[PDB]
Amino acid sequence: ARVMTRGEGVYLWDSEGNKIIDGMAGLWCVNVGYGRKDFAEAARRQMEELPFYNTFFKTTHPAVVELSSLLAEVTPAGFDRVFYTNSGSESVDTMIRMVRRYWDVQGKPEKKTLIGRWNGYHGSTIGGASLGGMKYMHEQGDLPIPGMAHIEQPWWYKHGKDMTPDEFGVVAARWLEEKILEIGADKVAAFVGEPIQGAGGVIVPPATYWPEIERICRKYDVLLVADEVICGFGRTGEWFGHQHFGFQPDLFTAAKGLSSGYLPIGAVFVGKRVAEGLIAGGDFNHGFTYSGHPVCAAVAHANVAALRDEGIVQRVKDDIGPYMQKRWRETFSRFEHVDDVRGVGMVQAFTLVKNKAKRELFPDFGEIGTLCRDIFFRNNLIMRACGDHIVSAPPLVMTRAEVDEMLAVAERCLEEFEQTLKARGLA
Amino acid sequence: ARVMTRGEGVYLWDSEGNKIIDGMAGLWCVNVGYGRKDFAEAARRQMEELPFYNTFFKTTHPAVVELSSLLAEVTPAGFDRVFYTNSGSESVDTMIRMVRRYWDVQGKPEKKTLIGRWNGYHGSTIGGASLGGMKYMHEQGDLPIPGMAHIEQPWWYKHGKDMTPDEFGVVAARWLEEKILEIGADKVAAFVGEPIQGAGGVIVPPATYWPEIERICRKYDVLLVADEVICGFGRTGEWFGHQHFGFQPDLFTAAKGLSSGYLPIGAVFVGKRVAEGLIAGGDFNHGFTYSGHPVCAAVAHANVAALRDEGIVQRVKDDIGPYMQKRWRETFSRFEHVDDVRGVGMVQAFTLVKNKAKRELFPDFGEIGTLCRDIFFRNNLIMRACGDHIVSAPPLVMTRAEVDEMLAVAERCLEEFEQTLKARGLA
Numbered sequence: 113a114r115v116m117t118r119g120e121g122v123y124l125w126d127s128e129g130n131k132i133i134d135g136m137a138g139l140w141c142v143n144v145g146y147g148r149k150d151f152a153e154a155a156r157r158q159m160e161e162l163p164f165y166n167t168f169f170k171t172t173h174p175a176v177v178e179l180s181s182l183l184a185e186v187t188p189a190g191f192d193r194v195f196y197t198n199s200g201s202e203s204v205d206t207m208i209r210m211v212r213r214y215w216d217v218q219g220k221p222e223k224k225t226l227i228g229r230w231n232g233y234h235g236s237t238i239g240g241a242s243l244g245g246m247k248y249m250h251e252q253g254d255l256p257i258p259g260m261a262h263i264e265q266p267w268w269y270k271h272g273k274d275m276t277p278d279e280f281g282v283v284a285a286r287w288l289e290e291k292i293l294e295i296g297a298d299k300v301a302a303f304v305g306e307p308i309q310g311a312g313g314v315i316v317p318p319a320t321y322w323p324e325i326e327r328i329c330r331k332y333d334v335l336l337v338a339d340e341v342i343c344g345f346g347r348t349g350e351w352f353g354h355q356h357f358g359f360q361p362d363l364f365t366a367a368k369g370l371s372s373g374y375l376p377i378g379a380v381f382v383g384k385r386v387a388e389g390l391i392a393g394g395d396f397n398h399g400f401t402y403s404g405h406p407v408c409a410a411v412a413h414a415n416v417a418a419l420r421d422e423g424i425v426q427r428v429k430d431d432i433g434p435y436m437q438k439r440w441r442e443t444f445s446r447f448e449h450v451d452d453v454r455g456v457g458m459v460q461a462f463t464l465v466k467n468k469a470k471r472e473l474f475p476d477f478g479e480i481g482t483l484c485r486d487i488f489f490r491n492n493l494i495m496r497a498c499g500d501h502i503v504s505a506p507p508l509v510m511t512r513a514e515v516d517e518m519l520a521v522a523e524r525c526l527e528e529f530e531q532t533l534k535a536r537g538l539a
Numbered sequence: 540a541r542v543m544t545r546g547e548g549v550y551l552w553d554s555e556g557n558k559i560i561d562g563m564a565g566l567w568c569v570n571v572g573y574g575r576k577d578f579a580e581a582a583r584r585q586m587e588e589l590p591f592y593n594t595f596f597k598t599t600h601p602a603v604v605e606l607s608s609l610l611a612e613v614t615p616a617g618f619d620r621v622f623y624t625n626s627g628s629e630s631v632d633t634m635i636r637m638v639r640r641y642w643d644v645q646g647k648p649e650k651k652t653l654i655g656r657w658n659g660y661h662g663s664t665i666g667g668a669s670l671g672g673m674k675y676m677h678e679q680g681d682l683p684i685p686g687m688a689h690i691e692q693p694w695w696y697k698h699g700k701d702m703t704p705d706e707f708g709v710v711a712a713r714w715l716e717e718k719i720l721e722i723g724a725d726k727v728a729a730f731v732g733e734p735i736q737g738a739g740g741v742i743v744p745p746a747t748y749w750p751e752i753e754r755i756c757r758k759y760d761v762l763l764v765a766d767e768v769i770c771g772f773g774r775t776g777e778w779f780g781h782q783h784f785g786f787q788p789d790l791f792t793a794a795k796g797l798s799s800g801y802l803p804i805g806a807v808f809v810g811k812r813v814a815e816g817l818i819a820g821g822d823f824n825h826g827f828t829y830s831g832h833p834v835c836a837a838v839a840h841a842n843v844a845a846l847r848d849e850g851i852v853q854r855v856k857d858d859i860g861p862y863m864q865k866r867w868r869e870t871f872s873r874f875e876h877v878d879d880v881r882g883v884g885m886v887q888a889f890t891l892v893k894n895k896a897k898r899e900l901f902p903d904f905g906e907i908g909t910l911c912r913d914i915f916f917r918n919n920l921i922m923r924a925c926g927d928h929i930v931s932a933p934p935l936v937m938t939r940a941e942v943d944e945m946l947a948v949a950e951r952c953l954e955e956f957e958q959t960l961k962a963r964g965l966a
């Protein structure tokens with residue numbers, strides 16, 4: 113009858129009194145960790161004083177203006193316009209309509225197709241599911257909607273062949289050039305991608321990938337959109353994934369990580385180029401002014417202020433990031449059936465493989481991931497299996513102690529993994 | 540630059556010290572009226588104690604179970620399964636995917652087309668905007684996606700011709716039969732409609748309309764979906780619009796009215812037929828179990844408990860509804876350029892017309908509505924203009940006094956309207 117009692121820092125406690133390490137930070141979003149009583153209070157205060165604004169007033173609710181001011185301080189230059197939503201899924205959907213509307217305004221109404229990636233995830237809307245490349249969303253029949261295409265994911269371990277990462281990076285990106293040319297540049301609105309594919313299994317692209325993607329977008333006059341749903345609000349040590357990989361998207365989407373998951377909220381950050389365009393069109397002015405649930409906005413403000421003023425983000429870049437990465441590699445590198453050990457900031461992962469030498473994957477990709485995950489679970493550690501990949505994204509406020517503590521349990525579980533593997537003769 | 544200070548009951552106050560009557564209850568959703576400090580407290584408590592649950596636990600957060608249990612008590616028979624979202628727009632989107640998935644499971648994957656209405660509104664997603672029939676989101680571009688069709692709205696004043704309401708009702712509904720037959724019954728997944736079209740201008744369908752719609756859906760094995768975004772949580776005096784019009788939809792969608800707008804939340808209520816179907820498919824099990832932001836769920840619980848236990852809904856049926864309707868008609872019936880005075884419960888409206896005898900509308904439908912609205916606004920009353928329709932949906936806790944007070948100001952504004960009409964020679 114196991115029931116969650118409470119959560120604190122990086123831990124969750126059950127009814128039987130057991131403590132669970134949340135190596136996933138809820139749904140990749142509990143960035144400041146659990147237990148932030150101060151957030152409850154910011155909520156209480158805002159609900160009490162002014163939980164609504166009205167379009168009667170022709171102004172913006174002060175708790176939204178506040179959030180916007182602070183966001184502009186932590187986001188790259190030129191991201192002045194922000195459109196608030198209730199979720200990452202809505203952010204994606206809004207982004208889609210914004211991209212299409214932008215081209216309309218430009219007198220290029222046939223520029224409508226957005227390109228995404230297989231094993232990409234952009235939420236659960238029809239719009240987002242059709243943009244995302246999860247294989248079990250696309251055979252559905254209705255997905256994808258037209259104006260959606262997909263290229264293969266830059267996953268080196270499977271698609272690298274004999275190429276080096278850097279080399280594969282150029283190839284993997286060039287798939288965007290192929291798809292654009294195949295479709296017609298005059299029909300393509302945008303490429304959308306997570307800097308690191310989260311739900312795809314923390315597929316980290318080679319260093320050559322993103323600058324090539326961007327060159328291609330610019331070449332063919334296609335907008336570039338980063339989906340910062342998972343990589344946003346300090347996850348890679350930078351404020352946003354795209355900053356780490358060193359590309360400048362024309363828009364980017366954010367989700368409940370903006371509030372550490374405390375209340376539902378998302379946003380679309382819009383750059384100068386597109387902002388100017390949407391304003392002339394006027395379609396979205398209402399959202400840029402009146403968007404943002406005030407209570408949610410106040411909790412988001414608290415969370416971002418914590419992220420900055422408590423040096424949580426800088427700490428990922430400087431201290432806990434490098435440490436986690438080093439320790440992550442140290443801990444996991446040595447296993448027989450564990451390969452492509454990878455990570456940046458506080459997102460990290462590895463893949464379970466049949467044989468590292470041949471770079472051979474297990475059959476029925478995901479069944480072996482399940483087996484490993486059940487173990488982490490029976491051992492009161494939360495790490496998720498995406499197919500045969502194992503992924504972790506703990507709260508950003510995790511300590512060096514907590515790091516070692518988590519890895520300790522993971523270590524033990526993987527030892528147990530190899531055994532059960534041999535014990536079954538699947539090793 | 541007027542700034543909203545606070546809100547209380549049905550009133551909002553500005554920085555200049557003026558009091559404004561909110562005849563619209565925010566965005567049709569502030570059902571229990573402003574100032575509910577008890578909601579702040581339910582929020583504060585939930586955020587403090589347990590603002591998250593984890594899928595590790597294989598149970599449902601208690602604040603969600605609670606909400607579900609209470610909802611089941613107030614919703615019609617057979618609406619056991621509920622899927623929570625953050626918004627009305629998401630609810631619509633989820634509903635669409637549910638409908639399509641249901642038919643897949645049934646071995647009928649080509650049953651994909653949903654039918655909506657012109658001047659219908661089902662939110663702002665791509666999915667919802669393509670289902671809705673606002674022609675200002677329905678031109679040359681992305682919308683609509685395939686698997687979306689539209690029939691004309693049952694708007695008597697324009698489409699009635701020489702028929703009586705009840706007569707027109709049968710015709711207007713039969714448009715669904717025409718569209719189905721035109722498309723092929725084997726390709727049609729569902730008909731979706733707001734019991735009363737809200738943002739379309741509170742178009743109230745004849746009494747014959749909905750039972751006919753349902754007969755047609757059942758005839759052709761097409762699902763029937765009510766969009767209770769605006770009509771839900773007591774607006775028509777009943778719990779849900781469809782109860783008032785006497786049809787039983789297989790699913791219905793709900794929005795922030797579930798929480799009186801205090802925190803973002805929505806839901807899809809799923810009937811036995813479809814629930815059974817989606818469970819066999821298993822696609823949606825995760826949401827039926829783990830869906831619902833707990834903080835939002837706790838605020839929603841408070842709001843529903845208030846709606847019931849404080850007899851706010853009953854009060855709309857018995858007391859304030861009849862009164863408002865009577866007084867609404869009394870007040871507005873007598874004007875030269877005001878016709879189709881209409882309403883049920885606490886939703887009510889009228890249309891500005893050039894000449895009532897010919898049933899002739901003003902040209903550039905909406906310009907005249909703008910002029911009237913500016914007046915309500917310059918007089919510190921909130922009522923919205925949808926084209927040339929004028930609509931009101933004040934909080935449900937409005938008193939007889941507040942009713943008369945609102946109508947008083949509206950009266951004056953309409954007197955002023957007629958004059959400015961003559962003064963321009965547009966009368």
Ligand SMILES: Cc1ncc(COP(=O)(O)O)c(/C=C/C(=O)C(=O)O)c1O
Pocket residue numbers: 139140198199200201202204233234235236306310311339341342367368
């Ligand atoms: C890449 C990516 N883009 C968009 C969304 C949509 O945000 P929501 O509206 O909060 O669902 C998700 C969400 C899914 C998870 O959070 C998860 O993977 O657990 C996502 O991963």
Ligand SMILES: Cc1ncc(COP(=O)(O)O)c(/C=C\C(=O)C(=O)O)c1O
Pocket residue numbers: 566567625626627628629631660661662663733737738766768769794795
């Ligand atoms: C009929 C109808 N169906 C669905 C939605 C979507 O809910 P949200 O996720 O809250 O946007 C809306 C929303 C818009 C308004 O309420 C408004 O027009 O003020 C709606 O009117």
Ligand SMILES: [Cl-]
Pocket residue numbers: 477
């Ligand atoms: Cl595979």
Ligand code: NA
Pocket residue numbers: 120121122123514
């Ligand atoms: Na901790």
Ligand code: NA
Pocket residue numbers: 610611612613614615616617618619
């Ligand atoms: Na029920």
